[PDB]
Each structure stands twice: as C-alpha cells, then as structure tokens.
Amino acid sequence: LRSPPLLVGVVSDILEDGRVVVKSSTGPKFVVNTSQYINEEELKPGARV
Amino acid sequence: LRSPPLLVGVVSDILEDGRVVVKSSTGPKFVVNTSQYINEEELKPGARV
Amino acid sequence: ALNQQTLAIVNVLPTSKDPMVYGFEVEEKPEVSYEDIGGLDVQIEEIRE
Amino acid sequence: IRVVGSEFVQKYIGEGARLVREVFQLAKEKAPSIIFIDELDAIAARRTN
Amino acid sequence: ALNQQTLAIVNVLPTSKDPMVYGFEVEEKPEVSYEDIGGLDVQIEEIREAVELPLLKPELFAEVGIEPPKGVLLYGPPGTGKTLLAKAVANQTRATFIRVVGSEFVQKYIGEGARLVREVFQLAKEKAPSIIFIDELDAIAARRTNSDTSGDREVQRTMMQLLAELDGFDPRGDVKVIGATNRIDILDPAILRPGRFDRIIEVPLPTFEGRIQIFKIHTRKMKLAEDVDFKELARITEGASGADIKAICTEAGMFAIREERAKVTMLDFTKAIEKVLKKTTPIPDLKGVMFV
Amino acid sequence: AVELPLLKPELFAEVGIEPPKGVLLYGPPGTGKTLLAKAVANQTRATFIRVVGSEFVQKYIGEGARLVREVFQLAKEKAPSIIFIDELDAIAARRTNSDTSGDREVQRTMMQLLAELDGFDPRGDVKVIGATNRIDILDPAILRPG
Ligand SMILES: Nc1ncnc2c1ncn2[C@@H]1O[C@H](COP(=O)(O)OP(=O)(O)OP(=O)(O)O)[C@@H](O)[C@H]1O
Ligand SMILES: Nc1ncnc2c1ncn2[C@@H]1O[C@H](COP(=O)(O)OP(=O)(O)OP(=O)(O)O)[C@@H](O)[C@H]1O
Ligand SMILES: [Mg+2]
Ligand SMILES: [Mg+2]
C-alpha cells in the first residue's frame, strides 16, 4: 500500500459509521472504510490522503 | 439488444496514403482505415461517418 | 437505458427527461384570473372580444 | 410567455432578434398560446428616412 | 452507496457537506452589529422587517395575509456598507450565516457545480432558520451568451436552479434568501424579474444624518482632543460613500502621527478630507463673474 | 503606508485607526509604479507574493475563481505579506453591459477579488497593492478608497 501505485484523493466528508467519503482527483467520490493507519481527527474536509 | 457499437466521427482531413483521419466525438483523433464498399470520393472533410 | 457492453438500447426509461424553461417567465395556465382583477371591468370585456 | 422589454435591445444586435424567434417557436410548440410582449416603447419606435 | 464492479444500492449515505460547503459557515458571529454601522436611517428598519422579523414568526406573517420576501436584494453603490449589513443580520438572527460567492457555483465541469446550487439549499432547510447570502449576483444572474458552450450552459443552468428553488421553498419564511448586488443594469432580469424576487431594497450613500453617525462610530475608537464637529465634515463630504468616510478617518489619524500627535482635532480632519475628496468627485472653485 | 504598520503595528494601534489595507497606483505608464513595488519588496522582507492580473483567469470558468481564492488563502497564513497584483483592469474593467463570451468572465473574477480583501473576510495584514496602466479603466469599486 505504502508503495506506488498511489493516488491522492482529498477527503469530501467523514462518516461515523466507520467510513470516509473521499473525493478523488480522478473524478468520482467513493466510500472506503477507516483503518488504524490513520486518525479521523487529523482528517478534515480538504484533508489530502 | 446485442446490436454492435460504431463510434461516430467527422472526417478531419483525407490523407493521400489511402487512410482518413476521423476525429471521434469521444475526443481523440484516430487514423482509421476504410471498407471496400466505402471510398474517399464519397467522403469530404466534415463528412459524418 | 443501454446495455452498456454493446451500448445498444435495452429499455426506454419513462419520464423521458424534465424540460428546461426558456423564454421565462412562462406560466402554463396562469393563476391570475380575471376575478383576481377588478376595477378595469370594461377592459376585460374588450380584450375578450 | 413573458418577454420583457429589458432583455430586448442591445448596443448592437442579433441576440435581441433570436428571442422574438424563441417565443414564436415555443408558441407553436405549446399551443393554445398568448405571447405577452412588453415594453413596446423601447423596442418599437419612430422610423428615420 | 453503489458497488464499483456491479452498481447496486447497499446503503444510504447522509450528506451534509463537501469542502466548499464547510468554508461557507459558521464564523460564530462577526464584529459588526447595527451598533457598529451608522445611520442610513430608514433602510435599517426595512432590511430588518424583510429578514429578521418573519424569521422569528412566519406564523404572524401568514396570519395577517401578507407575503414575506421571496428573496432580498440590496442594490446601491459600492462601499455604502452592504455585505457589512449582512454581518449584522448574522449577529442577531442567530441563525447560521452562509457566506458564498456566486462565482463558485459555476465551475470547470458540470455538476461540481450545478449539484452545488441544490446542495446549498438542502443545507439551508435542515439548518433552518437561515439565512443564505449570495452576494453580488453577476455569474448566477448573468445574461445568456447564446452560446460560449463550455461557459454558457453552466451559467444558464445555475441561474435557473437558484430562482426555481426560492420560489418553491418559500411561500412563508422557513429559509429566507438574502443577497446583494453592485450592478444589475449590466445584466438582464432574472433577479430583477418581479415573478421571482419582489423585494429590492435601495441602499444609497448616506443621508446627512447618516454621515454624522458613521463619523461618530469611527471616532469612538479614535483618541481625540475636543474642538471637532462631525456635522460640518459631513457637509463637505456630501455625495461620498460610507467607505470614503472610513478612508478619511484612517488618513486623519495617520496625519496625526506625522504631526507627532495621537489625538485627532478638527484641523486634522479637514486636511484629511482635502486629500481624499480632491482624488474623488469634486470640489467647487468658481461661481462665475456673473453670479456670486 | 506599508512599511510602517507592517514593521510596527503598535503606532496605528495607539491612535485608534486601522492600518492601511493597500495602495492603488495610477497615472502615466512608465513612471516606475511596479519599479516602486520592487523597491518596497527589498526592504519589507516579509514575503512578497508576485502575480500578474493576466496570469489570473484560465481556460474554464471558475479556474480563475479558484486562483483568486488560492492567493488570498495563502496570504492569510503568511500575514503580514504583500500581494502585488499587476493589473486590476485585467480582472475587473468598466462596461456598459457584457457582450458576453469573454466579457462576462471579467465580473466573475471581480466578485472573487472583493469578498477577500475586507469584503467580509479578515484581511490579516494584507496589503494588496495594485496598479493600472491608464487612469480610468477600472470600476468604481476599486476606485473607491476602503
Ligand atoms: N455605515 C458604516 N459603518 C461602518 N463602517 C462602514 C459603513 N459603511 C461602510 N463602512 C466601511 O466600509 C468598508 C466596507 O465596505 P464593504 O466591502 O463592506 O462594501 P459593499 O457596499 O457590500 O460593496 P461591493 O459593491 O464592492 O461588493 C469598511 O472599511 C467598513 O468599515
Ligand atoms: N524613477 C526612475 N528612474 C529610472 N528609471 C525608471 C524610473 N521609473 C521608471 N523607470 C524605468 O522605466 C521603465 C518602465 O517602468 P516600469 O516598468 O516600472 O513601469 P509602469 O509605470 O508600472 O508600466 P505598464 O503600464 O507598462 O505596466 C523601466 O525600464 C524602469 O526601470
Ligand atoms: Mg459588497
Ligand atoms: Mg506596470
């Protein structure tokens, strides 16, 4: 995962069900689940990831 | 329902090397060949094909 | 709606798209009625003729 | 269908003529129809010879 | 939620924001109140009756029989203090002040964008009572090119989505739409159409009485040694805007620094007006040799 | 106007007036208006943002808008800082009415500039220094001091 291919997406909003809406720079927004490799406190609308 | 898809384009220019460049309505430009029933006498630049 | 692995039509979708008003304001069947205007009684009777 | 007298006319013209053509077009399409045409003292006026 | 490889509904997703909506509120109430804005004096009451009053009680507006505003324009010169009236409303309505630029609903590709115009009003409805100010409509009330094609469809769609929504979420206060414009004689009716908005508040560069109060409020914070009269200055700077009056106050005090002083005096002001007013609509200097 | 409140905000504070929000420069071209701007840049040393008003506005609508948000947003974090935008007639120039293809985009850009300056937003200590080639080719809004 830490290797490329990697893609910058920028957080759209953060859901409390345990998912994150990320607006990708490709185009589409998508819902992906949280991990213990992040903090959602650090995540914010406009957080690069 | 299974009817094949044909891309639409308009002739950009007619080349003298027996091929025609037809710019699709998808976006890209392509050098396309031709069928043995269709000829360059029936095409003009800005001809829909 | 197209079966998108051949891009051929499989179904006409009812509603058929909501139209977009141009030449605004357009009021198809106006709510202002002749009872909703008084004092120009004689002008009503003329414009009707 | 209301076209106001405010849209009508520009400093040089062509777009002003299109919208007369526009309401004529809708009226045919959407018959019976009453085309309100204000304010005819800023788009009609004295001829010059 | 749809799946990538199959596209089937599996869940619902509750939307309330995207990054753009997040930067539009809240600033937890500005530093401007009607305390910090001088007189106009009548147009203060009007803007209050148009917004603030139906907000607390659409029941009383309906009961009577009268239609509240369907949208509010402030129209008048720049710098008369309009976006300035909008912060004031924000402090006392206590109703979430959405600040958005009408330039941001028209964007590079399509339903970035158009989706955004309907998004601001969805927000509005759950956050209610509210209080959406959009702000100098010159890109959401623009005339149609016919056509610029990349540009024009965006401006045309987004224009229509504003007007149609306000018409329909307001018979009575619920979401109040408020706004402002610099110019409107540059563009065609859309918000100057009386079948959409119907309340346009004329807000003009200020009356005699208005001018004095603005000088008073600016000078309130200024250190002074008294021989000053605000009323005389007010006469000289007749025909100037509220921001010209501010610009003179800021120069009179800089002038004081040059004098080696921090108290402002009537002399300091009169010089300060001369500099400014002269770079501005003019000062007389002859009444003919055939008149006095 | 600039070097003085940037380098010593205390003295404007003591009188009770606000610091300056800017300087507009006009008159005859070639008198050294942008030269002067490079002159103050060498002595402020407090982060000199250099843009040009014809480097604002790009090929799709709202990318320009995006650019104007992008200079001010950066400037609030470095503040004090100098945003010197070379032409303000290149982002907002007087019209009778728009005629519309290229003309409309101009007022679109203008809306974005107002807003941030102290339109509504905190300005920090910017200090947007303008210039124009010709005396009157701006709008009243820019012309107006404040
Ligand atoms: N009546 C007033 N009371 C206090 N400050 C005022 C008054 N009117 C104007 N000002 C001052 O004028 C400046 C604010 O101008 P502002 O940007 O709010 O303008 P606007 O009329 O909404 O303009 P635009 O047409 O450019 O969008 C500030 O310096 C503000 O203090
Ligand atoms: N006071 C001066 N002493 C010497 N040269 C100067 C002086 N003022 C300006 N110049 C020179 O004049 C030329 C043009 O001036 P500069 O490019 O700074 O002008 P401007 O008034 O901002 O113009 P534009 O309308 O083209 O944007 C430069 O070569 C500059 O160095
Ligand atoms: Mg304003
Ligand atoms: Mg120059």
XYZ file of C-alpha atoms and ligand atoms in Angstrom:
698
model
C 0.000 0.000 0.000
C 2.893 2.448 1.010
C 4.388 1.712 -2.362
C 3.096 3.278 -5.551
C 0.697 2.965 -7.470
C -0.661 5.542 -5.062
C -3.315 8.176 -5.798
C -4.048 11.449 -3.895
C -7.605 11.799 -3.061
C -8.909 14.669 -0.950
C -11.461 13.909 1.832
C -15.011 15.020 0.945
C -16.553 14.443 4.467
C -16.116 11.869 7.256
C -18.845 9.404 8.314
C -19.270 7.953 11.859
C -20.447 4.590 10.705
C -16.718 3.841 10.250
C -16.342 5.084 6.634
C -14.781 8.154 4.895
C -16.128 9.875 1.668
C -13.115 10.787 -0.375
C -13.389 12.935 -3.497
C -10.756 11.595 -5.804
C -8.728 13.893 -8.079
C -9.598 11.358 -10.831
C -13.183 12.474 -10.725
C -15.582 10.128 -8.669
C -16.186 10.233 -4.866
C -16.156 6.904 -3.069
C -16.733 5.438 0.408
C -13.919 3.480 1.867
C -13.555 2.185 5.482
C -11.304 3.503 8.210
C -8.086 1.989 9.396
C -5.737 2.142 12.346
C -3.112 3.570 9.910
C -4.901 6.948 10.204
C -6.682 9.152 12.685
C -10.019 10.722 11.605
C -9.196 13.632 13.893
C -6.402 14.518 11.505
C -8.822 14.028 8.623
C -10.956 17.002 7.853
C -12.879 18.182 4.617
C -9.886 19.132 2.410
C -7.515 16.701 4.003
C -5.108 15.262 1.460
C -4.660 11.471 1.820
C -30.189 -5.730 -27.846
C -26.834 -7.154 -28.768
C -26.501 -4.626 -31.638
C -22.711 -3.765 -32.202
C -21.404 -0.216 -31.232
C -19.936 2.005 -34.019
C -18.212 5.232 -32.965
C -19.302 8.357 -34.675
C -16.857 10.792 -36.060
C -16.478 13.535 -38.643
C -13.656 13.450 -41.238
C -10.725 15.795 -40.171
C -8.714 15.518 -43.389
C -8.241 12.823 -46.127
C -4.744 11.565 -46.387
C -3.045 10.608 -49.715
C -1.748 7.348 -48.157
C -5.214 5.768 -48.573
C -6.315 6.402 -44.965
C -8.506 9.024 -43.443
C -8.164 10.773 -40.021
C -11.501 10.918 -38.420
C -11.856 12.696 -35.188
C -14.301 10.881 -32.865
C -16.967 12.509 -30.668
C -15.377 10.816 -27.791
C -12.483 13.176 -28.058
C -9.407 11.562 -29.554
C -8.351 11.598 -33.093
C -7.748 8.416 -34.954
C -6.183 7.303 -38.280
C -8.777 4.863 -39.500
C -8.773 2.516 -42.430
C -11.756 2.008 -44.765
C -14.061 -0.751 -46.121
C -14.072 -1.921 -49.766
C -17.597 -0.636 -50.222
C -16.700 2.915 -48.954
C -14.459 5.206 -50.807
C -12.766 8.621 -50.449
C -14.737 10.054 -53.453
C -17.840 9.812 -51.259
C -16.090 11.499 -48.361
C -15.285 15.120 -47.874
C -13.837 16.677 -44.823
C -16.745 17.277 -42.408
C -18.458 14.163 -43.580
C -20.100 12.190 -40.837
C -19.037 8.543 -40.840
C -31.043 2.806 -20.875
C -28.269 0.926 -22.823
C -26.898 -2.487 -22.152
C -23.542 -0.979 -21.819
C -21.496 -3.982 -23.037
C -22.822 -3.396 -26.512
C -24.120 0.144 -25.992
C -27.443 -0.834 -27.671
C -30.811 0.317 -26.391
C -32.442 -2.339 -23.995
C -35.149 -0.099 -22.428
C -36.857 3.343 -22.863
C -36.840 4.837 -19.429
C -40.246 6.599 -18.611
C -40.218 10.393 -17.614
C -38.053 10.927 -20.687
C -36.316 13.931 -19.067
C -37.646 17.091 -17.385
C -37.669 20.099 -19.903
C -35.946 23.424 -19.243
C -37.939 26.567 -19.366
C -36.673 29.172 -21.724
C -38.278 32.470 -22.679
C -39.034 32.983 -18.933
C -41.367 33.816 -17.292
C -43.673 31.116 -18.822
C -46.777 30.350 -16.847
C -48.652 27.487 -18.346
C -52.177 28.137 -17.077
C -51.774 31.346 -15.052
C -53.121 31.575 -11.579
C -54.108 35.228 -12.003
C -57.619 35.198 -13.358
C -59.993 37.899 -14.345
C -61.860 37.642 -10.955
C -58.482 38.416 -9.398
C -58.503 41.883 -11.056
C -61.222 44.326 -10.596
C -61.799 47.937 -11.449
C -60.903 47.515 -15.152
C -64.190 45.748 -15.842
C -64.631 47.281 -19.230
C -61.065 46.469 -20.288
C -61.731 42.810 -19.571
C -64.760 42.808 -21.825
C -62.709 44.362 -24.658
C -59.661 42.053 -24.527
C -62.010 39.075 -24.538
C -63.570 40.315 -27.842
C -44.974 33.645 -22.052
C -43.469 36.856 -20.922
C -40.530 38.547 -22.710
C -39.681 41.752 -21.095
C -38.573 44.984 -22.726
C -35.410 44.967 -20.553
C -33.886 41.909 -22.310
C -34.824 43.400 -25.653
C -32.306 45.604 -27.470
C -28.528 45.824 -27.120
C -25.942 48.352 -28.220
C -25.556 46.271 -31.442
C -27.992 43.466 -32.124
C -28.574 39.985 -33.110
C -29.291 38.167 -29.892
C -32.267 40.559 -29.423
C -33.841 39.063 -32.626
C -33.245 35.469 -31.565
C -35.502 35.722 -28.526
C -38.530 37.034 -30.666
C -37.798 33.890 -32.735
C -37.562 31.843 -29.472
C -41.058 32.889 -28.216
C -42.535 32.397 -31.643
C -41.037 28.865 -31.588
C -42.448 27.974 -28.131
C -45.836 29.321 -29.019
C -46.124 26.888 -31.948
C -44.959 24.040 -29.761
C -47.196 24.619 -26.733
C -50.390 25.943 -28.414
C -53.022 27.487 -27.494
C -50.761 30.372 -26.542
C -50.664 34.035 -25.527
C -47.389 35.830 -26.040
C -47.124 38.849 -23.700
C -44.826 41.429 -25.363
C -43.794 44.324 -23.159
C -42.490 47.140 -23.267
C -43.057 48.137 -26.818
C -41.902 51.790 -26.471
C -38.132 50.709 -26.113
C -38.047 48.130 -28.951
C -40.569 49.879 -31.290
C -40.093 53.463 -32.068
C -40.124 56.218 -34.919
C -38.622 55.281 -38.275
C -35.834 57.502 -39.743
C -35.574 58.003 -43.545
C -23.674 3.693 -1.957
C -23.219 1.745 -5.201
C -20.667 -1.036 -5.746
C -17.838 -0.415 -8.277
C -17.987 -3.636 -10.297
C -21.797 -4.220 -10.089
C -23.554 -0.954 -9.126
C -26.267 -1.926 -6.725
C -27.621 0.074 -3.719
C -26.292 -1.325 -0.475
C -26.504 1.547 1.947
C -27.593 5.123 2.220
C -25.021 7.830 2.744
C -26.012 11.015 4.718
C -24.680 14.031 3.005
C -24.354 17.374 4.619
C -21.080 18.644 3.310
C -18.279 18.739 0.909
C -15.279 21.094 1.377
C -16.862 24.007 -0.300
C -19.964 23.974 1.990
C -17.702 23.627 5.072
C -15.879 27.058 4.234
C -19.311 28.757 3.948
C -20.220 28.797 7.620
C -20.001 29.421 10.605
C -17.792 32.296 11.843
C -19.548 32.257 15.191
C -20.909 35.771 14.690
C -18.771 38.805 13.229
C -17.668 42.077 14.891
C -20.314 44.175 13.062
C -23.703 44.825 14.591
C -26.144 47.733 13.916
C -24.173 49.325 16.768
C -21.110 49.285 14.530
C -22.950 50.527 11.397
C -24.071 54.184 11.331
C -27.410 55.536 10.301
C -28.981 55.219 6.820
C -31.665 55.629 8.666
C -34.871 54.260 7.321
C -33.240 51.488 5.281
C -32.017 49.960 8.521
C -35.749 49.357 9.529
C -36.588 47.907 6.094
C -33.847 45.338 5.956
C -34.876 44.345 9.464
C -38.617 43.923 8.501
C -37.548 41.939 5.307
C -35.443 39.406 7.063
C -35.336 39.268 10.742
C -38.969 39.809 11.541
C -40.685 36.879 9.507
C -37.775 34.690 10.637
C -38.898 34.546 14.199
C -42.612 34.021 13.260
C -43.751 33.141 9.695
C -46.971 32.305 11.631
C -47.652 36.027 12.228
C -46.873 36.917 8.509
C -49.255 34.197 7.225
C -51.873 35.013 9.758
C -52.157 38.610 8.557
C -52.381 37.716 4.922
C -49.057 39.252 3.652
C -46.320 37.571 1.634
C -42.843 37.792 3.262
C -39.868 38.406 0.811
C -39.013 35.666 -1.586
C -35.526 36.957 -1.809
C -33.851 40.273 -0.706
C -31.568 42.310 -2.905
C -29.536 45.107 -1.618
C -28.775 47.389 -4.536
C -26.768 50.522 -4.450
C -23.293 51.959 -4.810
C -20.163 50.083 -3.513
C -18.894 50.839 -0.098
C -22.184 52.117 1.308
C -21.771 49.036 3.554
C -23.986 46.089 2.341
C -22.030 42.956 2.949
C -21.462 44.946 6.093
C -25.377 44.822 6.710
C -25.192 41.111 6.129
C -22.749 40.536 9.105
C -25.080 42.462 11.350
C -28.014 40.365 10.474
C -25.782 37.398 11.351
C -25.185 38.517 14.914
C -28.719 38.972 15.981
C -30.666 36.486 13.874
C -28.517 33.712 15.441
C -29.351 31.521 12.501
C -26.109 30.255 10.757
C -24.699 32.692 8.178
C -23.835 31.096 4.928
C -21.198 33.248 3.011
C -20.839 32.080 -0.589
C -19.657 33.646 -3.691
C -21.826 33.326 -6.776
C -18.709 32.678 -8.808
C -18.228 29.272 -7.071
C -21.458 27.685 -8.355
C -20.126 27.968 -11.906
C -17.113 25.711 -12.155
C -14.979 23.924 -14.692
C -17.062 20.786 -15.274
C -20.656 20.180 -14.801
C -22.411 19.353 -11.514
C -19.367 20.194 -9.468
C -21.196 22.775 -9.668
C -24.969 22.614 -10.610
C -25.156 19.953 -7.813
C -23.718 22.616 -5.560
C -26.663 25.107 -6.092
C -29.168 22.421 -4.982
C -26.649 21.427 -2.117
C -26.644 24.913 -0.540
C -30.437 24.841 -0.318
C -30.599 21.336 1.143
C -28.258 22.510 3.868
C -30.465 25.534 4.325
C -33.626 23.533 5.029
C -32.077 21.336 7.830
C -30.148 24.279 9.364
C -33.431 26.335 9.375
C -33.927 29.065 10.386
C -31.455 30.534 7.888
C -30.026 32.959 6.186
C -28.176 32.317 2.866
C -26.394 35.428 1.486
C -25.160 35.279 -2.080
C -23.566 38.217 -2.604
C -23.147 40.074 -5.890
C -25.045 38.153 -8.382
C -23.022 38.544 -11.620
C -22.459 34.961 -12.508
C -25.718 33.427 -11.372
C -27.855 36.203 -12.794
C -25.701 36.899 -15.897
C -27.434 37.076 -19.291
C -27.103 34.181 -21.728
C -24.288 34.387 -24.365
C -26.025 32.152 -26.889
C -23.531 30.424 -26.559
C -19.966 30.061 -25.253
C -20.805 26.468 -24.826
C -18.396 25.385 -22.180
C -19.047 28.526 -20.280
C -22.720 29.326 -21.104
C -24.543 26.101 -20.184
C -23.098 26.297 -16.703
C -24.158 29.919 -16.165
C -27.564 29.225 -17.640
C -28.464 26.159 -15.562
C -27.173 27.518 -12.344
C -29.167 30.699 -12.859
C -32.448 28.791 -13.234
C -31.706 26.435 -10.197
C -31.465 29.487 -7.901
C -34.688 31.055 -8.902
C -36.936 27.976 -9.125
C -35.833 26.696 -5.658
C -36.614 30.016 -3.757
C -39.961 30.203 -5.370
C -40.719 26.796 -4.155
C -39.275 26.598 -0.519
C -40.824 29.825 0.381
C -44.414 30.579 0.466
C -43.625 31.646 4.031
C -40.333 32.086 5.976
C -38.547 28.742 6.526
C -35.474 29.517 4.549
C -35.059 33.264 3.860
C -32.912 34.109 0.906
C -30.998 37.358 1.309
C -28.337 38.730 -1.021
C -26.870 41.889 -2.610
C -25.566 43.294 -5.965
C -23.323 46.155 -7.054
C -24.820 46.363 -10.539
C -27.851 44.898 -12.133
C -28.175 47.299 -15.086
C -25.395 45.396 -16.713
C -27.422 42.188 -16.920
C -30.924 41.074 -17.822
C -33.838 40.379 -15.342
C -33.698 37.040 -13.553
C -33.407 38.605 -10.075
C -34.825 41.875 -11.342
C -37.866 39.862 -12.546
C -40.806 40.551 -10.201
C -42.092 36.811 -10.582
C -39.011 35.578 -8.698
C -37.664 38.237 -6.203
C -40.003 41.088 -5.255
C -38.116 42.971 -2.573
C -35.254 45.129 -3.698
C -34.017 47.440 -1.003
C -32.448 50.519 -2.168
C -29.416 51.210 -0.064
C -27.816 54.535 -1.057
C -24.845 56.531 0.008
C -25.878 58.059 3.101
C -28.163 60.950 4.159
C -26.878 63.885 6.147
C -27.881 62.363 9.414
C -26.321 59.116 8.407
C -22.962 60.548 7.621
C -22.626 62.056 11.192
C -23.258 58.774 12.919
C -20.689 56.987 10.834
C -18.094 59.645 11.692
C -19.146 59.317 15.398
C -18.702 55.442 15.428
C -15.284 55.563 13.715
C -14.065 58.375 16.070
C -15.490 56.433 19.073
C -12.478 54.163 18.926
C -10.082 57.155 17.885
C -8.348 59.240 20.532
C -9.268 62.965 20.070
C -8.937 66.378 21.784
C -12.293 68.038 21.519
C -12.958 71.001 19.141
C -14.169 68.548 16.481
C -17.552 68.789 14.827
C -18.590 65.741 12.670
C -21.598 67.637 11.115
C -19.511 70.238 9.195
C -17.266 67.492 7.872
C -20.403 65.657 6.812
C -21.467 68.570 4.655
C -18.112 68.749 2.852
C -18.088 65.048 2.148
C -21.672 65.127 0.840
C -22.127 62.856 -2.071
C -19.373 60.433 -0.774
C -19.853 56.738 0.285
C -19.526 55.131 3.704
C -16.092 53.742 2.767
C -14.872 57.355 1.793
C -15.837 58.498 5.282
C -13.725 55.470 6.737
C -10.788 56.389 4.399
C -10.740 59.942 5.737
C -10.884 58.739 9.375
C -7.876 56.395 8.724
C -5.896 59.257 6.989
C -6.697 61.818 9.747
C -5.154 59.565 12.260
C -2.138 58.897 10.086
C -1.887 62.631 9.707
C -1.820 62.917 13.442
C 1.257 60.554 13.527
C 3.002 62.963 11.123
C 2.226 65.859 13.446
C 3.734 63.754 16.392
C 0.367 63.515 17.950
C -2.203 60.750 18.667
C -5.165 62.928 19.463
C -7.150 63.992 16.367
C -8.560 67.604 16.060
C -10.841 69.426 13.544
C -7.815 70.754 11.626
C -6.542 67.182 11.180
C -9.840 66.150 9.636
C -10.284 68.983 7.260
C -6.888 68.347 5.745
C -7.781 64.688 5.603
C -10.942 65.323 3.558
C -8.999 67.656 1.106
C -6.574 64.949 0.129
C -9.220 62.341 -0.379
C -12.184 64.383 -1.742
C -9.984 66.005 -4.376
C -8.986 62.485 -5.706
C -12.783 61.928 -5.809
C -15.924 63.803 -7.253
C -15.023 67.249 -6.982
C -14.594 70.363 -5.016
C -16.006 73.748 -6.416
C -13.722 76.753 -7.043
C -15.668 79.339 -9.187
C -19.249 80.607 -9.371
C -18.738 82.818 -12.472
C -18.253 86.612 -12.698
C -21.957 86.897 -13.386
C -23.131 85.175 -10.123
C -21.965 85.278 -6.537
C 1.548 53.294 4.479
C 3.063 49.800 4.189
C 6.450 49.609 5.766
C 5.216 51.424 8.841
C 2.292 49.340 10.113
C 3.906 46.017 8.893
C 7.128 46.610 10.769
C 5.493 48.492 13.754
C 1.713 47.828 14.121
C 1.828 49.444 17.651
C 1.748 53.061 16.469
C -1.528 52.793 14.381
C -2.911 50.859 17.355
C -2.132 53.731 19.780
C -4.176 56.336 17.714
C -7.188 54.027 17.204
C -7.267 53.972 13.399
C -6.766 50.745 11.323
C -3.521 50.125 9.399
C -3.780 50.791 5.552
C -5.317 47.885 3.540
C -3.413 48.785 0.371
C -2.242 51.365 -2.055
C -3.622 51.970 -5.628
C -1.119 53.274 -8.099
C -2.189 55.110 -11.288
C -1.163 57.649 -13.714
C 1.100 57.827 -16.728
C 2.804 54.492 -17.667
C 6.496 54.292 -17.321
C 6.842 56.446 -14.246
C 8.014 53.487 -12.224
C 4.928 52.056 -10.415
C 5.982 48.404 -10.418
C 9.575 49.599 -10.014
C 8.499 51.140 -6.673
C 6.814 47.856 -5.784
C 10.201 46.049 -6.284
C 11.817 48.846 -4.225
C 9.499 48.164 -1.101
C 9.911 44.317 -1.602
C 13.679 44.627 -0.898
C 13.009 46.403 2.481
C 9.859 44.723 3.829
C 11.408 41.159 3.752
C 8.074 39.738 4.836
C 7.061 37.582 1.841
C 6.326 39.336 -1.438
C 3.642 37.471 -3.465
C 4.149 38.254 -7.178
C 1.198 37.693 -9.548
C 0.040 39.493 -12.524
C -3.729 40.078 -13.425
C -3.309 38.491 -16.727
C -1.961 35.344 -15.031
C -5.388 35.243 -13.273
C -8.234 33.738 -15.411
C -7.817 30.421 -17.174
C -9.442 28.360 -19.978
C -12.639 27.159 -17.968
C -14.827 29.101 -15.825
C -14.160 29.013 -12.101
C -10.484 28.058 -12.510
C -9.804 31.757 -12.414
C -12.047 31.933 -9.363
C -10.086 29.147 -7.727
C -6.834 31.162 -8.468
C -8.118 34.262 -6.644
C -9.196 32.175 -3.661
C -5.788 30.484 -3.776
C -3.629 33.744 -3.399
C -5.639 35.182 -0.503
C -5.897 31.911 1.353
C -2.152 31.537 1.261
C -1.696 35.234 2.195
C -3.781 34.976 5.378
C -1.340 32.295 6.756
C 1.882 34.304 5.928
C 0.443 37.628 7.069
C 1.965 40.079 7.050
C 2.734 39.701 3.285
C 2.367 41.834 0.234
C 0.122 40.646 -2.609
C 1.072 42.765 -5.555
C -1.306 42.022 -8.489
C -0.057 43.909 -11.537
C -3.356 44.814 -13.239
C -6.754 45.090 -11.678
C -8.272 46.004 -15.076
C -7.352 42.580 -16.170
C -9.722 41.061 -13.639
C -12.419 43.815 -13.429
C -12.801 46.632 -16.048
C -15.822 49.100 -16.602
C -18.544 48.005 -19.029
C -21.807 49.235 -20.266
C -23.211 45.694 -20.327
C -21.498 42.419 -21.192
C -21.444 41.123 -24.744
C -20.701 38.257 -23.175
C -18.360 35.491 -24.224
C -15.184 36.939 -22.872
C -16.867 39.966 -21.293
C -18.835 38.155 -18.583
C -15.730 36.365 -17.189
C -14.349 39.703 -16.117
C -17.124 40.370 -13.449
C -16.952 36.774 -12.382
C -13.273 37.397 -11.445
C -14.185 40.798 -9.847
C -16.588 39.196 -7.351
C -13.859 36.909 -6.073
C -11.385 39.810 -5.527
C -13.854 41.954 -3.362
C -15.026 39.306 -0.810
C -11.485 38.527 0.358
C -9.889 41.926 0.507
C -12.062 43.030 3.580
C -15.313 42.393 1.742
C -16.336 40.225 4.600
C -13.129 38.250 5.362
C -10.348 39.027 7.850
C -7.599 40.590 5.886
C -4.840 39.904 8.337
C -2.399 42.495 7.250
C -2.709 42.396 3.532
C -1.964 44.971 1.875
C -2.949 44.204 -1.674
C -1.019 46.744 -3.782
C -2.491 47.424 -7.199
C -1.595 49.084 -10.423
C -3.289 50.082 -13.604
C -1.779 51.411 -16.815
C -4.371 54.028 -17.555
C -6.056 56.446 -15.123
C -9.688 55.312 -15.597
C -10.240 51.801 -16.929
C -11.225 50.334 -13.541
C -14.706 50.065 -11.945
C -15.890 52.452 -9.145
C -15.493 49.600 -6.648
C -11.731 49.539 -6.991
C -11.610 53.285 -7.444
C -13.384 53.779 -4.151
C -10.937 54.041 -1.219
C -11.623 51.469 1.612
N -22.182 52.727 7.586
C -20.947 52.214 8.011
N -20.495 51.919 9.249
C -19.230 51.412 9.430
N -18.289 51.085 8.527
C -18.735 51.400 7.313
C -20.027 51.934 6.996
N -20.192 51.865 5.628
C -19.050 51.488 5.119
N -18.088 51.170 6.091
C -16.713 50.716 5.836
O -16.546 50.487 4.525
C -15.720 49.277 4.290
C -16.619 48.005 3.942
O -17.101 48.067 2.536
P -17.820 46.768 2.075
O -16.719 45.987 1.498
O -18.497 46.171 3.265
O -18.914 47.065 0.890
P -20.379 46.806 -0.144
O -21.212 48.098 -0.205
O -21.064 45.453 0.229
O -19.571 46.662 -1.608
P -19.142 45.915 -3.187
O -20.154 46.726 -4.063
O -17.675 46.245 -3.531
O -19.422 44.469 -3.073
C -15.124 49.030 5.643
O -13.901 49.805 5.741
C -16.318 49.492 6.514
O -15.904 49.771 7.780
N 12.467 56.809 -11.375
C 13.078 56.097 -12.390
N 14.424 56.172 -12.645
C 14.899 55.431 -13.666
N 14.243 54.544 -14.480
C 12.982 54.421 -14.125
C 12.334 55.226 -13.148
N 10.960 54.993 -13.184
C 10.746 54.085 -14.089
N 11.969 53.767 -14.779
C 12.133 52.786 -15.882
O 11.073 52.920 -16.768
C 10.779 51.652 -17.341
C 9.316 51.273 -17.200
O 8.847 51.399 -15.824
P 8.122 50.261 -15.132
O 8.250 49.035 -15.956
O 8.492 50.122 -13.747
O 6.580 50.894 -15.231
P 4.830 51.085 -15.022
O 4.515 52.564 -14.846
O 4.333 50.157 -13.959
O 4.074 50.305 -16.523
P 2.994 49.403 -17.588
O 1.870 50.327 -17.971
O 3.785 49.011 -18.864
O 2.602 48.254 -16.704
C 11.769 50.686 -16.706
O 12.933 50.445 -17.536
C 12.064 51.390 -15.397
O 13.262 50.944 -14.862
Mg -20.394 44.128 -1.343
Mg 3.297 48.447 -14.857
